[PDB]
Design a protein around this ligand. Structure first.
Ligand SMILES: CC(C)(COP(=O)(O)OP(=O)(O)OC[C@H]1O[C@@H](n2cnc3c(N)ncnc32)[C@H](O)[C@@H]1OP(=O)(O)O)[C@@H](O)C(=O)NCCC(=O)NCCS
Ligand SMILES: [Zn+2]
Length: 260
């Protein structure tokens, strides 16, 4: 039996994919995860014992962003191996990506949490390969199912580009993108590009690669072969529309503490 249901915090969540937890963990009806240190446990009794004893109330690593009730922690795989391995096992339940089976040490993990008086509760994350030879600025991105459809995905995508900008570099998500990844990236890219029009220049200003700018402007019919072709009025009409709305949660540069 594979792991098919997890309990984490106040949520139970069904699996979407196989994840390589040790076999005896799959055998039980539920896998129980500490929401703060991501330890995985086999029994409600071991879970309850852990909850009473664990001192963690947020992710490890460095808190690098806080705005309203959300915060981001930067977690280097080399520095917090066990945590990042636990994270990857969790994530693999909802992602089919090869990096989830690989060493965590070559990666950095950006953990998104909602903060309240009880703690900083994980809602999603993205991973990033240090010094990616393919210029990938995200490897994996995930919003845990109970938190989906609230704008956290597009926040994580935006955050990944805010780092690329500060690194003075373009980047793209590791391909192939899942269908849900495609929808999310296209939405973000569309908004950013239209605000900027209200290609190498756009690429330099946004850290979005020219290829991803070209494919996005193609969908907006704002490019000829590549040359951008749109009026200010056309751009304003799109930004007025319900199809190219601003992300509900955006990254504020004056709430970030980060250098390359
Ligand atoms: C991709 C993912 C991170 C999006 O997270 P999220 O928090 O739901 O994203 P958002 O709330 O910011 O939504 C982004 C866009 O995706 C659309 N979307 C998200 N889930 C959708 C769904 N199930 N059906 C249709 N549209 C969906 C949203 O409506 C939104 O469109 P809009 O910007 O035009 O309004 C999330 O679906 C996920 O974690 N999936 C599993 C892992 C995965 O596939 N990751 C990406 C792999 S490359
Ligand atoms: Zn714990």
């Amino acid at each position: 039996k594979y792991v098919d249901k997890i309990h984490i915090g106040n949520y139970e969540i069904d699996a979407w994919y196989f994840s390589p937890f040790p076999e005896d963990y799959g055998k039980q009806p539920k896998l129980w995860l500490c929401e703060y240190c991501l330890k995985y446990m086999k029994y409600e009794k071991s879970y309850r014992f852990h909850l009473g004893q664990c001192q963690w109330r947020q992710p490890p690593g460095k808190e690098i962003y806080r705005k309203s009730n959300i915060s981001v922690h930067e977690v280097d795989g080399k520095d917090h191996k066990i945590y990042c391995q636990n994270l990857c096992l969790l994530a693999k339940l909802f992602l089919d990506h090869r990096t989830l089976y690989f060493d965590v040490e070559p990666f950095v993990f950006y953990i998104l949490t909602e903060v309240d008086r009880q703690g900083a509760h994980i809602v999603g994350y993205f991973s990033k390969e240090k010094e990616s030879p393919d210029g990938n600025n995200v490897a994996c991105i995930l919003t845990l199912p109970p938190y989906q459809r609230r704008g956290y995905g597009k926040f994580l995508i935006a955050f990944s580009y805010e780092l690329s900008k500060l690194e003075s570099t373009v980047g793209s998500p590791e391909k192939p993108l899942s269908d849900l990844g495609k929808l999310s990236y296209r939405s973000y890219w569309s908004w950013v590009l239209l605000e900027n029009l209200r290609i190498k220049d756009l690429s330099q200003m946004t850290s979005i690669t020219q290829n991803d700018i070209i494919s996005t402007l193609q969908s907006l019919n704002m490019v000829k072969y590549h040359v951008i072709c749109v009026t200010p009025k056309l751009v304003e009409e799109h930004l007025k529309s319900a199809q190219y709305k601003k992300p509900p949660i955006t990254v504020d540069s004056v709430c970030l503490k980060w250098a390359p």
